[PDB]
Write a protein that binds this ligand. Structure first.
Ligand SMILES: [Cl-]
Ligand SMILES: [Cl-]
Ligand code: NA
Ligand code: NA
Ligand SMILES: [Zn+2]
Ligand SMILES: [Zn+2]
Ligand SMILES: [Zn+2]
Ligand SMILES: [Zn+2]
Ligand SMILES: [Zn+2]
Ligand SMILES: [Zn+2]
Lengths: 29, 29, 29
């Protein structure tokens, strides 16, 4: 339970960082 | 409290995928 | 461990809100 929830939070954190960088790319063209 | 944390993570994973797809759309016009 | 999970989720929810606001500003503004 705990370990699966921690994995899902880490995957969201990684997606979170990738979407931030992608939104920054789109702002600059 | 644990169940609520999981329902909140599930809503956030759905919002995460929604933002990812909208960013993909914006990227292409 | 509990506090760290709750903190990560609040930070992700907050980042989710910041990223949606930037996306709306880029798409429409
Ligand atoms: Cl359920
Ligand atoms: Cl998120
Ligand atoms: Na509980
Ligand atoms: Na632990
Ligand atoms: Zn559970
Ligand atoms: Zn920016
Ligand atoms: Zn793509
Ligand atoms: Zn493409
Ligand atoms: Zn932990
Ligand atoms: Zn997010």
């Amino acid at each position: 339970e705990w370990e699966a929830l921690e994995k899902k939070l880490a995957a969201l954190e990684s997606k979170x960082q990738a979407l931030e960088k992608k939104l920054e790319a789109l702002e600059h063209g």
